[PDB]
Amino acid sequence: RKLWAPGVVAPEYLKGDLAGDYGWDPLGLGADPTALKWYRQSELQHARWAMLGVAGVLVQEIVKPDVYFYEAGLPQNLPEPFTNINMGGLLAWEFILMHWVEVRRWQDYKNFGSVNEDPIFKGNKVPNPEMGYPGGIFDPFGFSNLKELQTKEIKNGRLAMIAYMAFILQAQATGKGPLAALSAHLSNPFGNNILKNIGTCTVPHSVDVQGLTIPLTCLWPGS
Amino acid sequence: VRPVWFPGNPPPAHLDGSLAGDYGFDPLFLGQEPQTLKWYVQAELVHGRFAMLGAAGIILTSIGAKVGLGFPEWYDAGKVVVEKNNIDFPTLMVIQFYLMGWAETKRWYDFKNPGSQADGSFLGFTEEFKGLENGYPGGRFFDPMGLSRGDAAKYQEYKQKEVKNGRLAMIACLGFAAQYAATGKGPLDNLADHLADPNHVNFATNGVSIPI
Amino acid sequence: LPGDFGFDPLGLLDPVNSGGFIEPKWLQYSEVIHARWAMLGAAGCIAPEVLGAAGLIPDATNIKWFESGVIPPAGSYNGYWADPYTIFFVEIVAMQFAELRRLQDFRYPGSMGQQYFLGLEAIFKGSGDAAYPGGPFFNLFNLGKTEAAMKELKLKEIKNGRLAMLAMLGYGAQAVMTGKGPFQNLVEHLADPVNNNILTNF
Amino acid sequence: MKDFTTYLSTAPVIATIWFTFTAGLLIEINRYFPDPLVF
Amino acid sequence: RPLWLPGSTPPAHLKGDLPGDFGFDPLGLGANAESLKWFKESELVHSRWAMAAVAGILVQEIVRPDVFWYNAGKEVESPLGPLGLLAVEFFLMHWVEVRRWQDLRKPGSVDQDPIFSQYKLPPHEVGYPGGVFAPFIPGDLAELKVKEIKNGRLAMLAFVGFVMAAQVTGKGPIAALQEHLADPWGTTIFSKAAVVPGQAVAPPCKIPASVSYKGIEIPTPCFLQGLWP
Ligand code: CLA
Ligand code: CLA
Ligand SMILES: CC1=C[C@H](O)CC(C)(C)[C@H]1/C=C/C(C)=C/C=C/C(C)=C/C=C/C=C(C)/C=C/C=C(C)/C=C/C1=C(C)C[C@H](O)CC1(C)C
Numbered sequence: 001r002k003l004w005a006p007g008v009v010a011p012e013y014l015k016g017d018l019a020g021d022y023g024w025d026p027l028g029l030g031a032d033p034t035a036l037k038w039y040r041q042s043e044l045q046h047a048r049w050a051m052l053g054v055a056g057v058l059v060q061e062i063v064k065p066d067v068y069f070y071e072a073g074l075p076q077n078l079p080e081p082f083t084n085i086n087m088g089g090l091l092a093w094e095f096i097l098m099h100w101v102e103v104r105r106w107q108d109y110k111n112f113g114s115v116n117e118d119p120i121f122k123g124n125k126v127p128n129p130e131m132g133y134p135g136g137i138f139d140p141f142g143f144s145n146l147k148e149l150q151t152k153e154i155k156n157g158r159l160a161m162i163a164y165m166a167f168i169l170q171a172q173a174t175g176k177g178p179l180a181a182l183s184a185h186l187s188n189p190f191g192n193n194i195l196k197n198i199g200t201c202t203v204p205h206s207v208d209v210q211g212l213t214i215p216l217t218c219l220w221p222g223s
Numbered sequence: 224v225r226p227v228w229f230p231g232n233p234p235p236a237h238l239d240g241s242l243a244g245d246y247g248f249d250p251l252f253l254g255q256e257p258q259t260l261k262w263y264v265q266a267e268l269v270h271g272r273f274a275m276l277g278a279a280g281i282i283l284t285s286i287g288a289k290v291g292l293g294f295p296e297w298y299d300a301g302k303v304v305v306e307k308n309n310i311d312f313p314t315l316m317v318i319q320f321y322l323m324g325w326a327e328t329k330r331w332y333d334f335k336n337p338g339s340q341a342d343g344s345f346l347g348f349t350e351e352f353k354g355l356e357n358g359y360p361g362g363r364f365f366d367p368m369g370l371s372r373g374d375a376a377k378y379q380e381y382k383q384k385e386v387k388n389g390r391l392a393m394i395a396c397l398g399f400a401a402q403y404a405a406t407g408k409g410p411l412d413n414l415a416d417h418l419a420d421p422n423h424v425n426f427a428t429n430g431v432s433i434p435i
Numbered sequence: 436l437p438g439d440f441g442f443d444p445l446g447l448l449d450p451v452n453s454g455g456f457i458e459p460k461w462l463q464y465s466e467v468i469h470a471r472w473a474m475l476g477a478a479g480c481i482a483p484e485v486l487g488a489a490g491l492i493p494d495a496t497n498i499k500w501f502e503s504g505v506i507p508p509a510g511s512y513n514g515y516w517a518d519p520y521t522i523f524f525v526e527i528v529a530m531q532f533a534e535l536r537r538l539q540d541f542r543y544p545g546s547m548g549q550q551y552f553l554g555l556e557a558i559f560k561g562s563g564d565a566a567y568p569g570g571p572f573f574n575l576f577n578l579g580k581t582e583a584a585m586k587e588l589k590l591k592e593i594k595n596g597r598l599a600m601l602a603m604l605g606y607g608a609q610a611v612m613t614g615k616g617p618f619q620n621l622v623e624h625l626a627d628p629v630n631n632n633i634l635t636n637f
Numbered sequence: 638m639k640d641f642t643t644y645l646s647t648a649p650v651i652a653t654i655w656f657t658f659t660a661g662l663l664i665e666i667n668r669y670f671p672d673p674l675v676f
Numbered sequence: 677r678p679l680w681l682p683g684s685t686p687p688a689h690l691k692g693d694l695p696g697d698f699g700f701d702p703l704g705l706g707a708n709a710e711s712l713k714w715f716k717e718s719e720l721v722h723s724r725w726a727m728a729a730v731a732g733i734l735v736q737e738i739v740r741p742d743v744f745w746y747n748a749g750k751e752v753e754s755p756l757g758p759l760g761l762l763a764v765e766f767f768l769m770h771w772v773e774v775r776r777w778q779d780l781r782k783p784g785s786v787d788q789d790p791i792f793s794q795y796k797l798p799p800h801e802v803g804y805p806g807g808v809f810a811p812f813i814p815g816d817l818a819e820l821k822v823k824e825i826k827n828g829r830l831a832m833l834a835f836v837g838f839v840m841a842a843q844v845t846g847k848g849p850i851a852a853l854q855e856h857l858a859d860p861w862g863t864t865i866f867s868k869a870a871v872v873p874g875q876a877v878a879p880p881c882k883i884p885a886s887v888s889y890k891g892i893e894i895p896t897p898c899f900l901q902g903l904w905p
């Protein structure tokens with residue numbers, strides 16, 4: 001069972017029970033089992049939201065090559081039906097529905113096998129075989145074997161976490177999207193590199209939204 | 224076993240973990256005697272409860288003072304209350320010392336004799352001024368909602384929360400005092416100034432806290 | 436024992452009638468702590484000059500090492516994200532945590548693996564030996580699996596460290612006397628080895 | 638701490654504390670009531 | 677047995693005995709039984725006053741428009757003086773309240789009519805008298821008590837919503853509901869106020885200042901206006 005580096009011995013709590021186990025815990029954060037279950041759920045959440053974000057930024061840049069996702073959150077940079085919208089009501093919709101689904105998944109973590117049923121229509125229920133893997137209506141095509149697909153899912157999610165923070169970091173550095181930065185590196189690879197572009201954040205310093213000013217931050221003191 | 228304030232060192236012998244907030248913090252050994260430690264437990268609780276009460280007063284008055292509601296800042300509030308109303312200063316001082324000396328002397332002689340203030344000598348009241356622990360006087364008056372007699376483990380949890388929030392408010396009140404002594408401003412003004420420039424508006428820019 | 440070449444002319448590793456901070460347990464451990472801080476000091480005092488020489492970092496940086504803000508009389512770089520005292524309080528808190536937990540494992544061996552430190556307790560279980568904790572982070576890769584390989588790596592750490600300590604003392608004396616950086620002293624000694632020495636700069 | 642208060646209970650320490658209290662009380666009286674000769 | 681969170685466990689003092697018991701006590705305020713009797717009575721009394729209040733505000737806005745219910749104490753007119761109405765309310769409510777409180781502290785001791793020795797109210801539980809207070813009952817008490825506590829909790833939330841929507845918008849509940857039906861994306865509480873670490877914005881209070889009644893200048897403040905947004 002290849003590990004994260006040659007010669008390194010995996011810890012005693014890392015065995016192969018979880019998918020994508022390379023024995024890599026140099027801080028010993030998964031030494032407690034309940035904390036390890038919580039960080040596995042957090043890994044699944046960050047992995048799936050980052051895969052959605054990478055596929056997002058990819059398609060948004062391909063289909064409409066004038067978005068520049070770093071500016072896409074503004075009210076002016078919005079699609080054709082909703083393009084001058086009150087952001088308060090949008091955040092209200094998001095807060096209510098996300099607080100609902102999030103509290104459902106949190107109670108799944110707290111009590112495994114207790115929020116499977118639909119509370120309104122009581123003849124509906126998802127069978128979750130593992131924690132973090134609901135199934136049922138969440139698996140409509142139903143390809144689930146399961147272990148190798150979970151390894152594919154966690155490797156893709158780790159790669160997409162690294163790639164999304166790459167997108168954010170690069171986009172703060174040179175002010176361009178990922179495909180535009182790829183075309184800039186393919187134009188000349190020696191000029192327009194990381195050796196030149198870093199040190200200058202393209203963060204536009206507290207954009208005034210409709211009523212308020214958000215403080216904007218760069219991950220490094222570039223300015 | 225239990226978490227100590229200073230990891231690696233063992234706790235002292237007189238701090239066992241029976242007390243709420245018992246982290247073994249006694250480097251000057253001020254409480255080796257059990258009676259002196261009992262007295263200091265009650266002094267810690269009284270200072271903590273006054274600091275929580277005063278710190279919530281500071282925070283609410285400063286929230287009302289930054290937004291234009293006309294509230295004073297807390298270093299001017301006593302002057303503008305005595306001058307806005309027709310209140311004379313020394314009569315309100317003496318009435319405060321009357322009421323506070325009554326209540327505090329009842330607490331004092333209940334520390335000296337640990338069940339004695341529930342003899343019915345005060346107006347007719349009995350077992351409503353009997354204490355429960357040192358510094359924990361819960362009856363019908365001081366604990367009207369009745370949380371110290373059901374779910375005793377949850378009551379120990381509330382004791383821990385009370386001591387932690389009290390130490391936090393004591394260092395917060397010391398913060399308000401020293402913070403105003405350096406900056407000369409209200410505390411949430413200083414909070415807004417820290418949120419404006421965190422890297423440049425802080426205690427290493429006053430010229431007071433580090434004079435180098 | 437690592438680096439035991441017998442060079443002790445003033446006799447300070449004598450176990451008989453020893454005490455205080457002059458003990459083999461304190462002296463060997465402080466020797467490797469000074470060695471590691473001086474390796475980091477030597478690399479850090481060279482690296483801006485050679486990265487400005489190679490043209491990798493810009494000319495706003497690449498300043499001499501004593502002009503960083505260590506000695507504001509000797510020069511100070513403005514362009515950090517804060518004032519150096521705002522940096523220095525973060526340094527106080529951070530180094531207080533690090534150095535102080537390291538002190539507690541020296542005085543009480545193994546004591547840093549019991550009390551809760553956000554799950555970071557198996558990382559700091561240490562060994563039955565100071566100066567070489569190991570574990571999952573201080574020795575990430577299993578390097579020194581053979582005991583003889585471990586002794587050889589400890590000896591190489593000792594020798595590279597003592598060389599770096601001599602180098603940092605040289606950076607200090609060179610920085611005071613000629614007023615320039617150490618890579619500038621490399622360029623001036625390699626250009627004219629006869630006419631640019633300590634005998635010239637008097 | 639018991640032995641430290643026993644040491645503070647010794648004769649020169651208590652004489653120092655008590656004469657500091659008595660001298661300070663007289664000094665504060667002569668400050669707030671400057672130069673009393675009668676009454 | 678349904679819960680406030682389906683799947684969790686109720687506190688150990690909440691068995692399911694009382695009506696409307698869904699295991700909701702995070703602070704543990706009902707672990708004392710002698711407290712829990714008082715709080716059950718207070719829950720019933722707050723719920724009944726709030727149900728009557730919400731019905732009063734709704735019928736008061738439907739039947740008589742152009743009367744803002746927050747100004748009902750101001751713009752009412754009667755040859756009945758204000759102190760005379762307040763005195764009648766004081767004596768009659770002191771009577772009724774002391775009868776109910778005596779039934780609380782002594783269970784079943786004020787059942788008999790004092791004027792007429794014939795009529796005695798039948799034995800019951802505290803909070804649920806019966807008799808002349810309940811001449812007609814539809815169905816069974818074991819479901820109607822649950823219906824009563826559910827409608828009452830909902831009306832308590834409705835009354836504090838009325839107070840906040842009147843202090844923020846300055847309009848009645850039906851008028852503010854039509855305001856939310858006109859622009860739902862633009863008229864919410866998220867759409868009027870926000871706090872960001874840069875700045876904070878709160879809605880202006882539409883109730884102006886101390887209100888001038890008949891030469892007394894009643895101070896009329898808006899509830900916790902510094903902690904609003
Ligand atoms: C307000 C006064 C006060 C008092 C009387 C106590 C009393 C106690 N503390 Mg508490 N403590 C306090 C404030 C106080 N504390 C604050 C503000 C914090 C947060 C920093 C703590 C954090 C703390 C911990 C972590 C622990 C204790 C513990 C204890 C108990 C044993 C220690 C002892 O014997 O010292 C008795 C103390 C005094 C007689 C008062 C000391 C006043 C000195 C002489 C003045 C100097 C104070 C400071 C250094 C400078 C402030 C001055 C300012 C103008 C700059 C005892 C009940 C231990 C315990 O077992 O809890 C139950 C324990 O583990 N305390
Ligand atoms: C003035 C008389 C005096 C004498 C005769 C001694 C003698 C001794 N001390 Mg003591 N000590 C003294 C003052 C003195 N000390 C003072 C003032 C302090 C408080 C700082 C101490 C605190 C102290 C500790 C903590 C320890 C000793 C130890 C010792 C013993 C071995 C020290 C040694 O040789 O190591 C060689 C000396 C060094 C490695 C340090 C030299 C460099 C430091 C910084 C001193 C620099 C002095 C110099 C004048 C400053 C120049 C400043 C200028 C360049 C700007 C020896 C018995 C040690 C012991 O007990 O072991 C058995 C021990 O652990 N002493
Ligand atoms: C433990 C120990 C032990 C060992 O042995 C030794 C040692 C170390 C020494 C020790 C320690 C100690 C400490 C730390 C202490 C501290 C304390 C504090 C700070 C307190 C406060 C405390 C504090 C407090 C009470 C406070 C309170 C407050 C208040 C009321 C306030 C009030 C007010 C207000 C509202 C406002 C208005 O307008 C004004 C006023 C009037 C201003």
Ligand SMILES: CC1=C[C@H](O)CC(C)(C)[C@H]1/C=C/C(C)=C/C=C/C(C)=C/C=C/C=C(C)/C=C/C=C(C)/C=C/C1=C(C)C[C@H](O)CC1(C)C
Nearest residue numbers: 443444445446469472473475476479480500503600603604
């Ligand atoms: C052997 C013996 C034996 C006999 O018995 C006796 C006798 C003789 C006594 C002995 C001897 C000894 C000796 C010789 C010693 C020496 C030492 C040294 C030199 C040290 C240093 C040491 C040194 C060290 C640590 C150092 C360190 C450093 C550092 C950190 C630095 C840092 C830095 C950097 C990076 C850069 C920037 O800019 C900043 C700074 C801040 C600047």
